[PDB]
Amino acid sequence: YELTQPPSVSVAPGTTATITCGGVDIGSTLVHWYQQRPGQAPLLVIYDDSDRPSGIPERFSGSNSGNMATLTISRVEAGDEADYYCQVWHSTSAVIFGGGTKLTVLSQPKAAPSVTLFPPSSEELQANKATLVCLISDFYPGAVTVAWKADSSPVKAGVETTTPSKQSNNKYAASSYLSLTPEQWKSHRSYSCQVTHEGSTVEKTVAPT
Amino acid sequence: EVQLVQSGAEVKKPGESLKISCKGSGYRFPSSWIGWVRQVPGKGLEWMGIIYPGDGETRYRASFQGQVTISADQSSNTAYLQWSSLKASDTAMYYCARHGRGVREVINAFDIWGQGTMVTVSSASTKGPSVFPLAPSGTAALGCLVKDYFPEPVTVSWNSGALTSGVHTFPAVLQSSGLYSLSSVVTVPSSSLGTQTYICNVNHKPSNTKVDKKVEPKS
Amino acid sequence: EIRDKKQEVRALFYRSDIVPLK
């Protein structure tokens, strides 16, 4: 059994934020919603579909029916920016959390990422290692997806990516690493880092030559 | 108040056993389930198992059966999560959470959470970083890559703190080798590349290492 | 209706606090 949540949701402050939780016949069970801020433990904000624990403001509400449950935050405020998780008790030994949803409360206009792709330095090659470094900066909201291409084929082996982190200017930055042997590095025509953000993709390419 | 207090952060090697704890206070320990939840940094929540301290009934996610054991101490009001043989893929934050026992008088959800215990599994011991330049080629980005160090943290500055605008140091990644790597980057006017000198200062106190690396444009 | 669903769901993890079980 799987609970489906949108990976990211962004809303203007003061409007109504809606986060959905996708499950088969999820309306026949009870859905609970937890809030997690970066570096902190989760916090129960809704239980039994529509019930608020003490200390949770009334703008938080919930519903559940058919194949979808919904968390609703009216008059959403900057303080509500956070990750949100839906959760159910499906069967005796099955407790399931949704994938989570990063709720951003827009404090500034959307900004596309600036991407810089560094090839392996000569010194690293002298150490018998090759690392392509893709640095991504100055994007907002802080949600991107990174893909690597060798020539034109996607590669998943040897890829390490960090979670976006706030810059000084409240925009976000991330980094991705592709690990190759010097032989691999030299035996391909080109390598590409592709960063997708808010439906638009920025691509950078480097070649051994 | 009702609270769960978890044990401190752990750094262990593959194949070793581990036991982390969760101390409940302010409520009747026997009458609430205690669940364990795993969160790899940057990822989502994963349920591992749950125990009812009143009699020791345990339920596990199928994939975690045989890797972990959950137990409880009714005198110290303490729940335990235990690995017999750790793997590198066990690196994560681990939370305990209280769950009602299925009556209307209580919240039938994870209403109280522990603060989390970070567990890092690596075969490595203390090791200083290798610093490589990320050379630039009307602004240009240049940086340095701090590679294969253990344990955290390393601090990075530029020109001994004199260059601070356009500077960002990224969080570290834990490689399959058990070692950490990170990058630091700075954006500078492309006209100053010829004259100005840019040096990143890496400091790794656990290994008592300082490295100054001048990053230059390549031909 | 919500009561029926609540009973159905809570039956999965219901534990009595009275020992021994009657």
Side-chain angles (χ1 to χ4, degrees), chain B residues 149-179:
Chain B
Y149 65 92
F150 191 93
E152 293 255 64
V154 300
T155 68
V156 183
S157 73
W158 284 86
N159 293 349
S160 310
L163 183 51
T164 61
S165 62
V167 171
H168 190 86
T169 301
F170 296 88
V173 295
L174 180 61
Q175 300 162 123
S176 57
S177 59
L179 304 170

PDB file of all heavy atoms in Angstrom, chain B residues 149-179:
ATOM      1  N   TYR B 149      37.150  12.986   3.892  1.00  0.00           N
ATOM      2  CA  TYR B 149      37.507  13.274   5.273  1.00  0.00           C
ATOM      3  C   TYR B 149      36.510  12.619   6.220  1.00  0.00           C
ATOM      4  O   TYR B 149      35.386  12.276   5.842  1.00  0.00           O
ATOM      5  CB  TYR B 149      37.559  14.781   5.543  1.00  0.00           C
ATOM      6  CG  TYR B 149      36.228  15.487   5.417  1.00  0.00           C
ATOM      7  CD1 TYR B 149      35.399  15.651   6.518  1.00  0.00           C
ATOM      8  CD2 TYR B 149      35.803  15.998   4.199  1.00  0.00           C
ATOM      9  CE1 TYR B 149      34.182  16.300   6.408  1.00  0.00           C
ATOM     10  CE2 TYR B 149      34.593  16.647   4.078  1.00  0.00           C
ATOM     11  CZ  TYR B 149      33.785  16.795   5.183  1.00  0.00           C
ATOM     12  OH  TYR B 149      32.578  17.443   5.062  1.00  0.00           O
ATOM     13  N   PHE B 150      36.945  12.439   7.469  1.00  0.00           N
ATOM     14  CA  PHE B 150      36.097  11.845   8.490  1.00  0.00           C
ATOM     15  C   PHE B 150      36.677  12.179   9.851  1.00  0.00           C
ATOM     16  O   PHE B 150      37.906  12.163   9.997  1.00  0.00           O
ATOM     17  CB  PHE B 150      36.000  10.326   8.312  1.00  0.00           C
ATOM     18  CG  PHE B 150      34.939   9.684   9.157  1.00  0.00           C
ATOM     19  CD1 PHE B 150      33.665   9.482   8.653  1.00  0.00           C
ATOM     20  CD2 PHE B 150      35.213   9.284  10.455  1.00  0.00           C
ATOM     21  CE1 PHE B 150      32.685   8.893   9.426  1.00  0.00           C
ATOM     22  CE2 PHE B 150      34.235   8.695  11.235  1.00  0.00           C
ATOM     23  CZ  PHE B 150      32.970   8.498  10.718  1.00  0.00           C
ATOM     24  N   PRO B 151      35.850  12.486  10.867  1.00  0.00           N
ATOM     25  CA  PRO B 151      34.405  12.719  10.811  1.00  0.00           C
ATOM     26  C   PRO B 151      34.077  14.175  10.497  1.00  0.00           C
ATOM     27  O   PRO B 151      34.985  14.961  10.233  1.00  0.00           O
ATOM     28  CB  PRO B 151      33.948  12.354  12.222  1.00  0.00           C
ATOM     29  CG  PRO B 151      35.095  12.770  13.074  1.00  0.00           C
ATOM     30  CD  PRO B 151      36.341  12.488  12.257  1.00  0.00           C
ATOM     31  N   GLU B 152      32.794  14.521  10.510  1.00  0.00           N
ATOM     32  CA  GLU B 152      32.391  15.910  10.398  1.00  0.00           C
ATOM     33  C   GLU B 152      32.862  16.686  11.626  1.00  0.00           C
ATOM     34  O   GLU B 152      33.139  16.097  12.673  1.00  0.00           O
ATOM     35  CB  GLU B 152      30.875  16.016  10.265  1.00  0.00           C
ATOM     36  CG  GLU B 152      30.322  15.458   8.967  1.00  0.00           C
ATOM     37  CD  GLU B 152      29.909  16.548   8.001  1.00  0.00           C
ATOM     38  OE1 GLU B 152      30.790  17.311   7.551  1.00  0.00           O
ATOM     39  OE2 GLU B 152      28.700  16.656   7.708  1.00  0.00           O
ATOM     40  N   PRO B 153      32.957  18.022  11.528  1.00  0.00           N
ATOM     41  CA  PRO B 153      32.744  18.888  10.369  1.00  0.00           C
ATOM     42  C   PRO B 153      34.040  19.500   9.845  1.00  0.00           C
ATOM     43  O   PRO B 153      35.065  19.440  10.527  1.00  0.00           O
ATOM     44  CB  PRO B 153      31.838  19.973  10.936  1.00  0.00           C
ATOM     45  CG  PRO B 153      32.396  20.172  12.323  1.00  0.00           C
ATOM     46  CD  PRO B 153      32.941  18.815  12.771  1.00  0.00           C
ATOM     47  N   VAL B 154      33.991  20.074   8.646  1.00  0.00           N
ATOM     48  CA  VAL B 154      35.055  20.935   8.149  1.00  0.00           C
ATOM     49  C   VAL B 154      34.471  22.330   7.984  1.00  0.00           C
ATOM     50  O   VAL B 154      33.302  22.489   7.615  1.00  0.00           O
ATOM     51  CB  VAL B 154      35.659  20.450   6.813  1.00  0.00           C
ATOM     52  CG1 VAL B 154      36.255  19.061   6.959  1.00  0.00           C
ATOM     53  CG2 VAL B 154      34.617  20.492   5.705  1.00  0.00           C
ATOM     54  N   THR B 155      35.289  23.340   8.247  1.00  0.00           N
ATOM     55  CA  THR B 155      34.893  24.722   8.026  1.00  0.00           C
ATOM     56  C   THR B 155      35.704  25.285   6.870  1.00  0.00           C
ATOM     57  O   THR B 155      36.898  25.000   6.739  1.00  0.00           O
ATOM     58  CB  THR B 155      35.102  25.575   9.279  1.00  0.00           C
ATOM     59  OG1 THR B 155      36.502  25.708   9.547  1.00  0.00           O
ATOM     60  CG2 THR B 155      34.417  24.939  10.480  1.00  0.00           C
ATOM     61  N   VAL B 156      35.054  26.081   6.029  1.00  0.00           N
ATOM     62  CA  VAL B 156      35.692  26.648   4.850  1.00  0.00           C
ATOM     63  C   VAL B 156      35.488  28.153   4.866  1.00  0.00           C
ATOM     64  O   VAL B 156      34.374  28.636   5.103  1.00  0.00           O
ATOM     65  CB  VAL B 156      35.136  26.042   3.548  1.00  0.00           C
ATOM     66  CG1 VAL B 156      35.874  26.607   2.343  1.00  0.00           C
ATOM     67  CG2 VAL B 156      35.245  24.524   3.577  1.00  0.00           C
ATOM     68  N   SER B 157      36.564  28.888   4.609  1.00  0.00           N
ATOM     69  CA  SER B 157      36.504  30.328   4.417  1.00  0.00           C
ATOM     70  C   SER B 157      37.281  30.673   3.156  1.00  0.00           C
ATOM     71  O   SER B 157      37.941  29.823   2.561  1.00  0.00           O
ATOM     72  CB  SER B 157      37.064  31.085   5.628  1.00  0.00           C
ATOM     73  OG  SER B 157      38.472  30.976   5.692  1.00  0.00           O
ATOM     74  N   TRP B 158      37.189  31.928   2.731  1.00  0.00           N
ATOM     75  CA  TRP B 158      37.895  32.377   1.539  1.00  0.00           C
ATOM     76  C   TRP B 158      38.714  33.610   1.873  1.00  0.00           C
ATOM     77  O   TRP B 158      38.206  34.554   2.484  1.00  0.00           O
ATOM     78  CB  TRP B 158      36.924  32.658   0.393  1.00  0.00           C
ATOM     79  CG  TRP B 158      36.420  31.407  -0.235  1.00  0.00           C
ATOM     80  CD1 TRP B 158      35.357  30.656   0.170  1.00  0.00           C
ATOM     81  CD2 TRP B 158      36.975  30.740  -1.373  1.00  0.00           C
ATOM     82  NE1 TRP B 158      35.209  29.565  -0.653  1.00  0.00           N
ATOM     83  CE2 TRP B 158      36.191  29.596  -1.608  1.00  0.00           C
ATOM     84  CE3 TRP B 158      38.054  31.003  -2.218  1.00  0.00           C
ATOM     85  CZ2 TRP B 158      36.452  28.716  -2.654  1.00  0.00           C
ATOM     86  CZ3 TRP B 158      38.312  30.129  -3.257  1.00  0.00           C
ATOM     87  CH2 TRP B 158      37.514  28.999  -3.467  1.00  0.00           C
ATOM     88  N   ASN B 159      39.985  33.588   1.473  1.00  0.00           N
ATOM     89  CA  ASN B 159      40.918  34.675   1.757  1.00  0.00           C
ATOM     90  C   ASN B 159      40.874  35.051   3.235  1.00  0.00           C
ATOM     91  O   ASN B 159      40.901  36.227   3.605  1.00  0.00           O
ATOM     92  CB  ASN B 159      40.628  35.885   0.871  1.00  0.00           C
ATOM     93  CG  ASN B 159      40.922  35.612  -0.590  1.00  0.00           C
ATOM     94  OD1 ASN B 159      41.521  34.593  -0.933  1.00  0.00           O
ATOM     95  ND2 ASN B 159      40.505  36.522  -1.459  1.00  0.00           N
ATOM     96  N   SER B 160      40.809  34.031   4.090  1.00  0.00           N
ATOM     97  CA  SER B 160      40.835  34.219   5.540  1.00  0.00           C
ATOM     98  C   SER B 160      39.696  35.124   6.002  1.00  0.00           C
ATOM     99  O   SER B 160      39.879  35.995   6.856  1.00  0.00           O
ATOM    100  CB  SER B 160      42.186  34.773   5.992  1.00  0.00           C
ATOM    101  OG  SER B 160      43.246  34.003   5.453  1.00  0.00           O
ATOM    102  N   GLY B 161      38.511  34.917   5.435  1.00  0.00           N
ATOM    103  CA  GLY B 161      37.343  35.685   5.806  1.00  0.00           C
ATOM    104  C   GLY B 161      37.205  37.024   5.120  1.00  0.00           C
ATOM    105  O   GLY B 161      36.194  37.704   5.331  1.00  0.00           O
ATOM    106  N   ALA B 162      38.183  37.435   4.313  1.00  0.00           N
ATOM    107  CA  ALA B 162      38.082  38.709   3.616  1.00  0.00           C
ATOM    108  C   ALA B 162      37.163  38.648   2.403  1.00  0.00           C
ATOM    109  O   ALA B 162      36.699  39.697   1.943  1.00  0.00           O
ATOM    110  CB  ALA B 162      39.471  39.176   3.184  1.00  0.00           C
ATOM    111  N   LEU B 163      36.903  37.459   1.870  1.00  0.00           N
ATOM    112  CA  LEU B 163      35.987  37.272   0.747  1.00  0.00           C
ATOM    113  C   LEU B 163      34.746  36.549   1.258  1.00  0.00           C
ATOM    114  O   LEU B 163      34.781  35.338   1.492  1.00  0.00           O
ATOM    115  CB  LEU B 163      36.670  36.495  -0.372  1.00  0.00           C
ATOM    116  CG  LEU B 163      35.865  36.269  -1.651  1.00  0.00           C
ATOM    117  CD1 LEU B 163      35.280  37.567  -2.166  1.00  0.00           C
ATOM    118  CD2 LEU B 163      36.744  35.628  -2.711  1.00  0.00           C
ATOM    119  N   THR B 164      33.649  37.292   1.440  1.00  0.00           N
ATOM    120  CA  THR B 164      32.426  36.712   1.974  1.00  0.00           C
ATOM    121  C   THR B 164      31.190  36.867   1.099  1.00  0.00           C
ATOM    122  O   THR B 164      30.180  36.216   1.388  1.00  0.00           O
ATOM    123  CB  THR B 164      32.102  37.321   3.343  1.00  0.00           C
ATOM    124  OG1 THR B 164      31.915  38.734   3.199  1.00  0.00           O
ATOM    125  CG2 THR B 164      33.229  37.051   4.320  1.00  0.00           C
ATOM    126  N   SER B 165      31.228  37.673   0.043  1.00  0.00           N
ATOM    127  CA  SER B 165      30.040  37.908  -0.769  1.00  0.00           C
ATOM    128  C   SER B 165      30.060  36.949  -1.950  1.00  0.00           C
ATOM    129  O   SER B 165      31.063  36.846  -2.663  1.00  0.00           O
ATOM    130  CB  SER B 165      29.960  39.362  -1.243  1.00  0.00           C
ATOM    131  OG  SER B 165      31.057  39.723  -2.057  1.00  0.00           O
ATOM    132  N   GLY B 166      28.940  36.260  -2.154  1.00  0.00           N
ATOM    133  CA  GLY B 166      28.836  35.225  -3.157  1.00  0.00           C
ATOM    134  C   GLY B 166      29.386  33.884  -2.729  1.00  0.00           C
ATOM    135  O   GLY B 166      29.534  32.999  -3.575  1.00  0.00           O
ATOM    136  N   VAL B 167      29.658  33.695  -1.438  1.00  0.00           N
ATOM    137  CA  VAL B 167      30.248  32.464  -0.921  1.00  0.00           C
ATOM    138  C   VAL B 167      29.144  31.561  -0.390  1.00  0.00           C
ATOM    139  O   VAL B 167      28.259  32.014   0.345  1.00  0.00           O
ATOM    140  CB  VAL B 167      31.273  32.760   0.187  1.00  0.00           C
ATOM    141  CG1 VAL B 167      31.701  31.471   0.870  1.00  0.00           C
ATOM    142  CG2 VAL B 167      32.483  33.485  -0.373  1.00  0.00           C
ATOM    143  N   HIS B 168      29.199  30.284  -0.759  1.00  0.00           N
ATOM    144  CA  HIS B 168      28.315  29.282  -0.177  1.00  0.00           C
ATOM    145  C   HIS B 168      29.085  27.987   0.024  1.00  0.00           C
ATOM    146  O   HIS B 168      29.745  27.501  -0.901  1.00  0.00           O
ATOM    147  CB  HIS B 168      27.083  29.023  -1.048  1.00  0.00           C
ATOM    148  CG  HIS B 168      26.049  28.173  -0.375  1.00  0.00           C
ATOM    149  ND1 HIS B 168      25.084  28.698   0.459  1.00  0.00           N
ATOM    150  CD2 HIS B 168      25.838  26.835  -0.398  1.00  0.00           C
ATOM    151  CE1 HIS B 168      24.319  27.720   0.913  1.00  0.00           C
ATOM    152  NE2 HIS B 168      24.755  26.581   0.408  1.00  0.00           N
ATOM    153  N   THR B 169      29.001  27.437   1.232  1.00  0.00           N
ATOM    154  CA  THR B 169      29.568  26.133   1.548  1.00  0.00           C
ATOM    155  C   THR B 169      28.420  25.142   1.676  1.00  0.00           C
ATOM    156  O   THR B 169      27.510  25.343   2.489  1.00  0.00           O
ATOM    157  CB  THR B 169      30.387  26.181   2.837  1.00  0.00           C
ATOM    158  OG1 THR B 169      31.441  27.143   2.700  1.00  0.00           O
ATOM    159  CG2 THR B 169      30.987  24.815   3.144  1.00  0.00           C
ATOM    160  N   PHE B 170      28.465  24.080   0.880  1.00  0.00           N
ATOM    161  CA  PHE B 170      27.378  23.120   0.831  1.00  0.00           C
ATOM    162  C   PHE B 170      27.503  22.092   1.950  1.00  0.00           C
ATOM    163  O   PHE B 170      28.592  21.863   2.482  1.00  0.00           O
ATOM    164  CB  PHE B 170      27.373  22.411  -0.519  1.00  0.00           C
ATOM    165  CG  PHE B 170      27.102  23.322  -1.678  1.00  0.00           C
ATOM    166  CD1 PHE B 170      28.140  23.984  -2.310  1.00  0.00           C
ATOM    167  CD2 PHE B 170      25.810  23.521  -2.131  1.00  0.00           C
ATOM    168  CE1 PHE B 170      27.893  24.828  -3.376  1.00  0.00           C
ATOM    169  CE2 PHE B 170      25.557  24.363  -3.197  1.00  0.00           C
ATOM    170  CZ  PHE B 170      26.601  25.017  -3.820  1.00  0.00           C
ATOM    171  N   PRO B 171      26.394  21.456   2.330  1.00  0.00           N
ATOM    172  CA  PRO B 171      26.482  20.345   3.283  1.00  0.00           C
ATOM    173  C   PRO B 171      27.256  19.179   2.688  1.00  0.00           C
ATOM    174  O   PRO B 171      27.360  19.019   1.471  1.00  0.00           O
ATOM    175  CB  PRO B 171      25.017  19.971   3.542  1.00  0.00           C
ATOM    176  CG  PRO B 171      24.266  20.504   2.366  1.00  0.00           C
ATOM    177  CD  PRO B 171      25.005  21.729   1.922  1.00  0.00           C
ATOM    178  N   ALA B 172      27.803  18.354   3.574  1.00  0.00           N
ATOM    179  CA  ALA B 172      28.617  17.229   3.151  1.00  0.00           C
ATOM    180  C   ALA B 172      27.741  16.066   2.697  1.00  0.00           C
ATOM    181  O   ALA B 172      26.579  15.933   3.088  1.00  0.00           O
ATOM    182  CB  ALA B 172      29.535  16.774   4.286  1.00  0.00           C
ATOM    183  N   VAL B 173      28.319  15.221   1.848  1.00  0.00           N
ATOM    184  CA  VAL B 173      27.714  13.959   1.444  1.00  0.00           C
ATOM    185  C   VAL B 173      28.558  12.833   2.019  1.00  0.00           C
ATOM    186  O   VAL B 173      29.791  12.924   2.051  1.00  0.00           O
ATOM    187  CB  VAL B 173      27.604  13.830  -0.088  1.00  0.00           C
ATOM    188  CG1 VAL B 173      26.648  14.867  -0.645  1.00  0.00           C
ATOM    189  CG2 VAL B 173      28.974  13.960  -0.742  1.00  0.00           C
ATOM    190  N   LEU B 174      27.897  11.776   2.477  1.00  0.00           N
ATOM    191  CA  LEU B 174      28.577  10.591   2.988  1.00  0.00           C
ATOM    192  C   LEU B 174      28.657   9.574   1.856  1.00  0.00           C
ATOM    193  O   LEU B 174      27.634   9.041   1.415  1.00  0.00           O
ATOM    194  CB  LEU B 174      27.852  10.018   4.203  1.00  0.00           C
ATOM    195  CG  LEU B 174      28.502   8.773   4.811  1.00  0.00           C
ATOM    196  CD1 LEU B 174      29.913   9.080   5.300  1.00  0.00           C
ATOM    197  CD2 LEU B 174      27.650   8.226   5.942  1.00  0.00           C
ATOM    198  N   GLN B 175      29.872   9.312   1.392  1.00  0.00           N
ATOM    199  CA  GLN B 175      30.093   8.422   0.266  1.00  0.00           C
ATOM    200  C   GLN B 175      30.041   6.965   0.715  1.00  0.00           C
ATOM    201  O   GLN B 175      30.152   6.645   1.902  1.00  0.00           O
ATOM    202  CB  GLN B 175      31.441   8.734  -0.386  1.00  0.00           C
ATOM    203  CG  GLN B 175      31.554  10.164  -0.904  1.00  0.00           C
ATOM    204  CD  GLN B 175      32.991  10.593  -1.142  1.00  0.00           C
ATOM    205  OE1 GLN B 175      33.359  10.989  -2.249  1.00  0.00           O
ATOM    206  NE2 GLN B 175      33.808  10.532  -0.097  1.00  0.00           N
ATOM    207  N   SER B 176      29.866   6.071  -0.263  1.00  0.00           N
ATOM    208  CA  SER B 176      29.840   4.643   0.031  1.00  0.00           C
ATOM    209  C   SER B 176      31.137   4.168   0.669  1.00  0.00           C
ATOM    210  O   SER B 176      31.162   3.088   1.270  1.00  0.00           O
ATOM    211  CB  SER B 176      29.574   3.851  -1.251  1.00  0.00           C
ATOM    212  OG  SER B 176      30.541   4.151  -2.242  1.00  0.00           O
ATOM    213  N   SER B 177      32.213   4.947   0.553  1.00  0.00           N
ATOM    214  CA  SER B 177      33.479   4.625   1.195  1.00  0.00           C
ATOM    215  C   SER B 177      33.468   4.886   2.694  1.00  0.00           C
ATOM    216  O   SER B 177      34.430   4.518   3.375  1.00  0.00           O
ATOM    217  CB  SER B 177      34.604   5.439   0.554  1.00  0.00           C
ATOM    218  OG  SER B 177      34.346   6.828   0.676  1.00  0.00           O
ATOM    219  N   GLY B 178      32.418   5.513   3.220  1.00  0.00           N
ATOM    220  CA  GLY B 178      32.378   5.889   4.615  1.00  0.00           C
ATOM    221  C   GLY B 178      33.005   7.228   4.928  1.00  0.00           C
ATOM    222  O   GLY B 178      33.129   7.573   6.109  1.00  0.00           O
ATOM    223  N   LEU B 179      33.399   7.993   3.913  1.00  0.00           N
ATOM    224  CA  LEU B 179      34.042   9.284   4.091  1.00  0.00           C
ATOM    225  C   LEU B 179      33.145  10.398   3.569  1.00  0.00           C
ATOM    226  O   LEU B 179      32.257  10.175   2.742  1.00  0.00           O
ATOM    227  CB  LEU B 179      35.390   9.322   3.362  1.00  0.00           C
ATOM    228  CG  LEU B 179      36.380   8.221   3.742  1.00  0.00           C
ATOM    229  CD1 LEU B 179      37.560   8.216   2.780  1.00  0.00           C
ATOM    230  CD2 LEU B 179      36.852   8.395   5.175  1.00  0.00           C
TER     231      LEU B 179
END
